[PDB]
Amino acid sequence: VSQRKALQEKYAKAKLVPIDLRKHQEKSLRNKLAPKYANKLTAQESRRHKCLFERKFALKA
């Protein structure tokens, strides 16, 4: 653990880390893409969402 905490600091904040120092996780959760990419909006869709967003409303008593 004296090795690993020192040796992780060398490779942390850098692209393509070693396999030992990657976190464990599941197979399914790695290969499932990050929710920004799934949820990102088309240039048609984003421009209409300027106006047609899910706005709040209510009724009078």
């Binding site: 399914s28 290969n31 499932k32 893409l33 990419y37 799934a38 990102k40 909006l41 088309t42 869709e45």
Partner: protein
């Protein structure tokens, strides 16, 4: 524009200009192996109808299916049981030949999502089909809102489960109306009708 003319040229396959071009291609395809990769698709216009867009990750593969129907499997041509089911040769496959084309190409290439296929050529022996594939892990397809639905794990091997355009034809999912009422799935619908239901109050 330009791909008006490619469409309207390809309508008239049986003509001296077009029949010449298809024979030269079909000569080349007989010498090469069964499943083989292309750099770019032989029919650009027809590719984009079925969902091809020329960027990194999108891959194209020709494949060769044998014409004619598939015979029954028996040991020494023996048939048993009731004589209504004694045929060997007059069978036809329930799958289309496009489906059998895609389903061969699926078995050879896992790690690779079939978008769709289409027809390129035929002779006496074989049909030829040009399957579009996608590498879903590649950043260009991982990005882009229009295409990245493929990257989800629900769409792993569509050709096996019959969710291609050719897949939806055999399943009879290509029509709406009185004829097509029975076939969610042909099977799913059958089960609902046949389940025996015992309500709690009777």
């Amino acid at each position: 524009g330009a791909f008006t003319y490619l469409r309207e040229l390809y309508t008239k396959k049986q003509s001296e200009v077009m029949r010449f071009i298809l024979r030269l291609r079909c000569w080349e395809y007989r010498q090469l192996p069964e499943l083989v990769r292309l750099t770019h698709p032989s029919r650009p216009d027809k590719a984009r109808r079925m969902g091809y867009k020329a960027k990194q990750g999108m891959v194209v593969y020709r494949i060769r299916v044998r014409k004619g129907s598939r015979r029954r499997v028996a040991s020494k041509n023996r048939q048993y049981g009731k004589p209504r089911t004694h045929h060997i040769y007059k069978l036809t496959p329930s799958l289309n030949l496009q489906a059998i084309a895609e389903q061969k190409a699926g078995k050879q290439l896992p790690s690779l999502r079939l978008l769709n296929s289409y027809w390129v050529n035929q002779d006496g022996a074989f049909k030829y089909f040009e399957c579009i594939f996608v590498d879903p892990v590649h950043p260009a397809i991982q990005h882009d809102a229009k295409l990245n639905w493929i990257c989800d794990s629900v769409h792993t091997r569509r050709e096996a489960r019959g969710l291609t355009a050719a897949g939806r034809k055999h399943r009879g999912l290509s029509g709406v109306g009185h004829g097509f009422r029975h076939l969610p799935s042909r099977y799913a619908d059958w089960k609902v009708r046949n389940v025996f239901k015992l309500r709690r109050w009777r």
